[PDB]
Design a protein around this ligand. Structure first.
Ligand SMILES: Cc1onc(-c2cccnc2Cl)c1C(=O)N1CCN(c2ccc([N+](=O)[O-])cc2Cl)CC1
Ligand SMILES: Cc1onc(-c2cccnc2Cl)c1C(=O)N1CCN(c2ccc([N+](=O)[O-])cc2Cl)CC1
Ligand SMILES: Cc1onc(-c2cccnc2Cl)c1C(=O)N1CCN(c2ccc([N+](=O)[O-])cc2Cl)CC1
Lengths: 430, 430, 423
């Protein structure tokens, strides 16, 4: 707890000090250093370094300008290592990768990659950290969704360190499944010699089941490097105060930060804001209802967002680019979870699924058809188990949201009530 | 294109000139000639002729009066042929039949005819042109729904020109199915010698499948004969301008026309208007949402309509009949389609059917149960195919509605969102 | 002109640059530097150093005369710490001039005084001052700039309300320097929009040895200004930390220009984050309202139009769950928390110095009011009473003019939509 916050606090302090340093080298104004487009470029540089470069955006003569500078990968590596007091500090590096992953999960649908892997494009909610490199951190492995892990394994399926790297991924995936039957099936894929089609068939099954019998996937609020550096510069001490990725800390920091974004002509600044907000709290596949309740303003589906990606291609001309303040604050806050929700328990039920007519009145007589009709080796155990599940089943009982003043999480607020961020395109209306 | 509009333009000009002629014979005032009840009677006469007669409604001494005149079927036939410059002009005749069919599809449910044919009364959406005579036009065959065609075939099943007339109907029905499996099944019904129960069983199957794997059925805006004649009389040239049944033309004409209807005491003139509007654009079984969006005012289900049929039986007394203006104009317009929508393609999917919890918050965890659970000879190919379909699947991508000023259909408007016109009676609430 | 806009941007550059220097001297954190409480102390320091009267006096009557102070605040060992810091006045004066390029630039000092005056009008209704002078405590709404000095510069004089001038005059009447009396009368007359009020204001101006009749005039002349309102300038003057922070981040007010009545101050607060210390039983939202109102001279406005511009409700004073911004020496620092001040707005509006078809002929027999623009048609001591009785609380002003989007930099498309100290 205290020990966790200590190290997390150190790596964020590292990223902070690096950014500030990196910002001075480029002779950037404070405002300019707080432009999200600049942060990502600087973030890109240090990851690429471990020549390199990219677009830097300045405010020259009343108009936005785009230079693109280059640095020695040795020069960058030296700046990173030294900002993290001697050490190579891989931890801060993989933290920036996860922030990039989170934003990629919010910005882009990845059906094109799904169809080549033989996977249902509707499995997107299982795809957390798919753009994240194979053999990422321990932190990376935690953040990767069930679908991400299935997709990595099929690519393998399609130099006997291959054997262990295959076994390493099966165990990662097994750790994520919350039922014994799903876990056992992963053993059968892992135990297999010369992996082929049966294994493919099985992994596609397991992916599908993870939509109802959800896996344990970690979520980490990871902010652009400018937010961290800005704080360090303003006099916040991440090592003395400690820090959390899953507590109030990131919400609290975003409440005291001001980030900017370059915005295109037809784009809506409010919509750009939602995208980066979603990315910041790793909520691309979180129910839109709960996101909305937390943020305070409506969190609208991807297809209704009047916005393109955060990054700006070298194609388009800067002469029409303007700068908006990204709204990243929130009405409430909530603890980020590793849980997938209830996948069994079985204990009791408690509820009502039909009515008994009391009054002679013309009307239909409602009943939960799926549930009533439902009740009439390891594969069937799963089928039988996910068939028992209802969309109405409640997870995270007792758990709620908190006021920004309730930093001890003493008094939770349980909310009362579309849901899919990616369920709103030209092919389907979900 | 130009050639199509040329002939369509001619037959509408024919119907026009006939009506004007027919109106003078009966010494009818222009207003009286634009009474929908009078148009249908005149329409009835020329169809019956190919003695005859029916009720004609006049404005005498401040009250509505009902005479019923008679004509020689030779006299009528002469008036029709000569209004269409020499030719027998069957094309204009079958056009009036389709207008009658459209209005019958909007006015009356036909479950009584469905139960005798051994068909599910819920198949009404497949029943376009069921009141239309067997061996109608080529135009008639196009307008007939899948259920209409199945019902005709069972009646056959229940003089070896019978053999071809059976084969002719199987090929009509086959043309309508958009999948190969459905088409193949029709071959098996057609190839059969001595048609009996297996064929019945099969046709009931095919009808059912056509609710999800919809067939290609044509739709034609066909207006009462008074609307056409009124235009010709006012100086519109249908041959010079050409005409379309599926383009902007009928919408444009309705925007420049004023039709009247006799309305009963308790009836709502707004509701009478919707019925004739639906009939005019062949939209009895079109989604109520899209109808509403096009019309501009709400298109209400049949069971919520405070109106009886357009026609007035010789029973009821005229002394309480009054005359209302039928509102048949529209906010937008749309192209009438021959398509049934997507019945396969299969190519990709793109969407989201579940959520991954990000925040520890008490709530249910939504998922598309039908779709997720779904994925666990020619008959089974169809079952397997319609089981893959979801109510959420989007058809007519890119296609939208148009402003009445956008006659070239250059800039479409894609709308964002009950649905069943006949899903609102004392037995069921759909 | 751009020049008018560039000289205003020059002084904000000065204030900004001065505040930055001051913070480095006080070894303050950036966060600590953006605490409204420190900003005030620092602001209070400069004005004290240039308070020649107090300095001339101290040169005669011995304290530590060369120094000046106030409480600075820091966060130490997880808790806020108040400390009385004493600073050498000459060094403050040097840093001011240096941050204003050798110039003593008293317009920069006056700006900060108007900010404090705006803050004072937001916090306290000043009934005791009013009754002592012999005027109605209800005249509350004409008291803008009353907490300012008598000689306060051109900007300061422009900001002062009608009742402020009246109070100054009555103080003098009840009390070589006939020039000060006559000058203040001109400054009073210039505020009056009607010619009838302007005439009576000259009768008082042109008088030797003013007494009863002159005192009685001003009191009625003030009473009239409640209905027949005066031309009182409203300027958006922000805490020095706001300006300091912007300069520090790289905003160039001289180059970019700046106004106190345009969109500028609204834009700045949109890109600012100001903190306040907050007592245990205080609503941070209500403190924020208070400072927001003080920022935009909004104290005596209609609450409705203030709410409409703001976005959230602008609750009246006696229903506001917060006390003053400053913290007294007797207050317990161990209970102090610091919070963000939400000072952003939904729309913006120009800040005024000010205080076709005329009728309708009915066509349809329908129950309704048959409206007519009362002023235009009808405008064709006793005259004052007549004018006051003629006017109605439902008659509209600033016709056509509305509010603008934050995105609408120019005055393109306006949007056409109560007592803060109400009993
Ligand atoms: C004024 C003012 O002056 N010094 C401070 C100040 C500075 C440092 C520590 N504590 C304080 Cl109080 C201050 C202030 O009120 N702050 C600054 C830091 N804030 C913050 C709180 C939590 C998180 N987090 O969890 O990431 C991030 C941030 Cl930046 C809270 C708001
Ligand atoms: C006045 C006025 O005088 N002559 C005309 C006039 C007459 C003939 C042709 N063009 C024109 Cl402009 C006119 C006019 O404005 N009309 C009349 C015909 N209209 C119409 C347009 C389309 C369709 N259609 O597609 O079936 C039907 C109809 Cl009736 C449009 C409105
Ligand atoms: C990113 C980013 O990088 N450089 C700038 C930048 C910096 C300086 C000038 N212009 C710009 Cl655009 C920038 C940005 O978008 N800003 C900073 C300044 N802002 C601002 C706008 C108006 C007023 N005012 O009227 O007082 C005050 C302020 Cl501080 C608007 C938001």
């Amino acid at each position: 707890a205290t020990e966790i916050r200590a190290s997390v606090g150190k790596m964020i302090d590292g990223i902070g000090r690096f950014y500030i340093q990196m910002c001075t080298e480029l002779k950037l104004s404070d405002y300019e250093g707080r432009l999200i487009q600049n942060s990502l470029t600087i973030e890109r540089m240090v990851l690429s370094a471990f020549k390199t470069g990219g677009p830097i955006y300045r405010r020259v003569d009343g108009k936005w300008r785009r230079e693109l500078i280059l640095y020695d990968k040795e020069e960058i590596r030296r700046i990173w290592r030294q900002a993290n007091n001697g050490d190579d500090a891989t931890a801060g590096l993989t933290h920036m990768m996860i922030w990039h992953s989170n934003l990629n999960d919010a910005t882009y649908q990845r059906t094109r990659a799904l169809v080549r892997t033989g996977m249902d494009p509707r499995m997107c909610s299982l795809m957390q950290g798919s753009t994240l490199p194979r053999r990422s951190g321990a932190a990376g492995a935690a953040v990767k969704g069930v679908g991400t892990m299935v997709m990595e394994l099929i690519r393998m399926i399609k130099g006997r360190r291959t054997r262990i790297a295959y076994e390493r991924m099966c165990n990662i995936l097994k750790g994520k499944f919350q039922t014994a039957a799903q876990r056992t099936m992963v053993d059968q894929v892992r135990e297999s010699r010369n992996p082929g089609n049966a294994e493919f068939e099985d992994l596609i099954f397991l992916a599908r089941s993870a939509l109802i019998l959800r896996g344990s996937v970690a979520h980490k609020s990871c902010l652009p490097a400018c937010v961290y550096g800005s704080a360090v510069a303003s006099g916040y001490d991440f090592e003395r105060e400690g820090y959390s990725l899953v507590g109030i800390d990131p919400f609290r920091l975003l409440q005291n930060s001001q980030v900017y974004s370059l915005i295109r002509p037809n784009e809506n600044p409010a919509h750009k804001s939602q995208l980066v907000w979603m990315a910041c709290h790793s909520a691309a596949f979180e129910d839109l209802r709960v996101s909305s309740f937390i943020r305070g303003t409506k969190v609208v589906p991807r297809g209704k967002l009047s916005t393109r990606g955060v990054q700006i291609a070298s194609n388009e001309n800067m002469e029409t680019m303007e700068s908006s303040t990204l709204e990243l604050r929130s009405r409430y806050w909530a603890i980020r979870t590793r849980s997938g929700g209830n996948t069994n328990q079985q204990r009791a039920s408690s509820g009502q699924i039909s009515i008994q007519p009391t009054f002679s009145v013309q009307r239909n007589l409602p009943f939960d058809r799926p549930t009533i009709m439902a009740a009439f080796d390891m594969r069937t155990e799963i089928i039988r188990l996910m068939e028992s599940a209802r969309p109405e089943d409640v997870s995270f009982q007792g758990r709620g949201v908190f006021e920004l003043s309730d930093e001890k999480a003493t008094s939770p607020i349980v909310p009362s009530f579309g849901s899919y961020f990616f369920g709103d395109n030209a092919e389907e209306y979900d």
